[PDB]
């Protein structure tokens, strides 16, 4: 176990906060506002994305937990991860799919709003035999609101900057793309020293299989559900990329506040494993899509 958690934990928090703020500014500095108003006036992809996220992902997590025979804590963790709003990293990576990026703003907003009022009920309905307690008040709302405001405020600043002085957009963006890139290494190794050794702790065939099959099933089901609704291919790509991703911070905080660290022995690094796996699948799908576009330019 981790004897010390003070190894630049606050420094890590602040450096990731700065990363998110800067990349949000750069991302919002290259996308309009009128298309957002059009999406709000005619909501078609938002509704299907929300129903896929809050009606299939929890169901997929429940079915996977039943099939793979996960323990109570592992089943609860995967269920919480499944019934989670799309993370900011989904917005970060959907730029590579270059698909209807203006829709992603209202997507994140509606996902956060729906999660805020639906996570208690949607987590209580599927908690039959798992965590007989109420669990309604243990879900963090302030964290959801903080994530929401950090996603939106720099996005609004970037939108205003693009609408006012487009000539300044290329200089702040491209250079920013450098700043968010190299600093990633500056924090990537920071994770390696922080995680230490976890090969014999968290790597379990059932947990590995569930963490492999959760984001992949989310991506596939989102894309299929968009396909049967006859949406734009860019819309299908962005819906899939948003429903596949999940927020692991919420699961980490809820598990930490609802159970002592002694009980969650290997589940402490489970959100990190899920994050690594979703990064791997996202990178793989980006490479596949880029190759498919390259072969037919």
């Amino acid at each position, epitope marked *: 176990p981790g004897f010390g958690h003070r190894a630049t934990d606050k420094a890590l928090s602040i450096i990731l906060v700065l990363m998110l703020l800067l990349i949000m500014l750069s991302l919002g500095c290259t996308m309009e506002f009128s298309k957002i108003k059009a999406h709000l006036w005619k909501p078609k992809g938002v509704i299907v994305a929300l129903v896929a996220q809050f009606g299939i992902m929890p169901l997929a997590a429940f079915l996977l*937990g*039943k099939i793979f*025979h*996960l*323990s*109570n*804590i592992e*089943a*609860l963790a995967i269920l919480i991860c499944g019934c989670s709003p799309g993370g900011n990293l989904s917005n970060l990576f959907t730029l590579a799919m270059k698909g209807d990026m203006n829709l992603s703003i209202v997507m994140t907003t509606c996902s956060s709003f729906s999660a805020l009022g639906m996570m208690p009920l949607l987590l209580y309905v599927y908690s039959k*035999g*798992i*965590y*007989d*307690g109420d669990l309604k008040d*243990k879900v963090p709302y302030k964290g959801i609101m903080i994530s929401l405001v950090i996603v939106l405020i720099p996005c609004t600043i970037g939108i205003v900057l693009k609408s006012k002085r487009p000539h300044y957009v290329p200089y702040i963006l491209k250079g920013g793309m450098i700043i968010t890139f190299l600093l990633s290494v500056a924090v990537t190794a920071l994770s390696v020293i922080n995680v230490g050794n976890s090969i014999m702790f968290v790597m379990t065939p059932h947990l590995l299989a569930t963490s492999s099959l959760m984001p992949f099933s989310g991506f596939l089901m989102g894309y299929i559900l968009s396909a049967l609704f006859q949406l734009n291919p860019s819309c299908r790509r962005t819906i899939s990329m948003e429903t596949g991703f999940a927020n692991i911070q919420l699961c980490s905080t809820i598990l930490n*506040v*609802t*159970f*002592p660290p*002694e*009980v969650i022995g290997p589940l402490f690094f489970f959100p990190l494993l899920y994050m690594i796996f979703q990064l791997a699948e996202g990178l793989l799908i980006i490479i596949i899509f880029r190759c498919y576009e390259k072969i037919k330019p």
Partner: antibody, heavy 121, light 113 residues
Framework: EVQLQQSGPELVKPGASVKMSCKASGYTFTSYIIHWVKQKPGQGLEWIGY????????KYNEKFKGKGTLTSDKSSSTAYMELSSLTSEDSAVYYCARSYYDGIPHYFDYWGQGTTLTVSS | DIVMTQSPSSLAVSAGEKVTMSCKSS????????????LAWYQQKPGQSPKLLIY???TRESGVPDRFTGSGSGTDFTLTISSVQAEDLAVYYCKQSYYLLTFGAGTKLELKR
């Protein structure tokens, strides 16, 4: 190994206002939850409710929801029970038991010595 | 809720003849996700606190005599002793924890005359 210490037999008037103490110092207190079991003389065991010392969550049986009140002290590693409503038929033996709790309590692998509570004039 | 009913509730065995204590519960208290089969068999000697004998209805706690063996699934469970000693005269409750913590009526063992 691990043992549970009970406060000891208590006689109280039907005016209620009694407290029951169970001390557990053989392990990490917050890792396991504490259940309370009531036994009438010759009527078998009966469940009351359990308390989680970590998050201070308590679950009560339907019969004992009105009267039972469970509290925990991490500094003293103790569990306290208050009923505040006693009658002549409430005299019985109360046991405190320790159980693991992953998502559902497993079983009472360790029990207290038992405290006899008498209610009369 | 789930209620447990033990059929015999009273029996006497002298030296070696085996005993069968069975409580049929109410419904199938077997977890589909994990093959745990939540059920616990306890022993309560007179003037003593209850002692745990078997957990998950098939596995026995370390330190108990090997004569105590429990087998069951779904709703039907049985606890049997290969050879009954003078120290096995107690009350067994076959508690369950699948949904809510409920105890059985109890089975009392005596000595035949």
């Amino acid at each position: 190994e691990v043992q549970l210490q009970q406060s000891g037999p208590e006689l109280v008037k039907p005016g209620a206002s009694v407290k029951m103490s169970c001390k557990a110092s053989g392990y990490t207190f917050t890792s396991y939850i504490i259940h309370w079991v009531k036994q009438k003389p010759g009527q078998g065991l009966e469940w009351i409710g359990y308390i989680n010392p970590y998050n201070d969550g308590t679950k009560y049986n339907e019969k004992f929801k009105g009267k039972g009140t469970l509290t925990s002290d991490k500094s003293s590693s103790t569990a306290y029970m208050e009923l505040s409503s006693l009658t002549s038929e409430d005299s019985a033996v109360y046991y405190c038991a320790r159980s693991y709790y992953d998502g559902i309590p497993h079983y009472f692998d360790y029990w207290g010595q038992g405290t006899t509570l008498t209610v009369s004039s | 809720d789930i209620v447990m009913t033990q059929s015999p509730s009273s029996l006497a065995v002298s030296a070696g003849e085996k005993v069968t204590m069975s409580c049929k519960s109410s419904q199938s208290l077997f977890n589909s996700r994990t093959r745990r089969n939540y059920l616990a068999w306890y022993q309560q000697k007179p003037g003593q606190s209850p002692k745990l004998l078997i957990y998950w209805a098939s596995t026995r706690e370390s330190g108990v005599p090997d004569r105590f063996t429990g087998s069951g699934s779904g709703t039907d469970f049985t606890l049997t002793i290969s050879s009954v000693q003078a120290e096995d005269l107690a009350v067994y409750y076959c508690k369950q924890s699948y949904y809510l913590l409920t105890f059985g009526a109890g089975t009392k063992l005596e000595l035949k005359r």
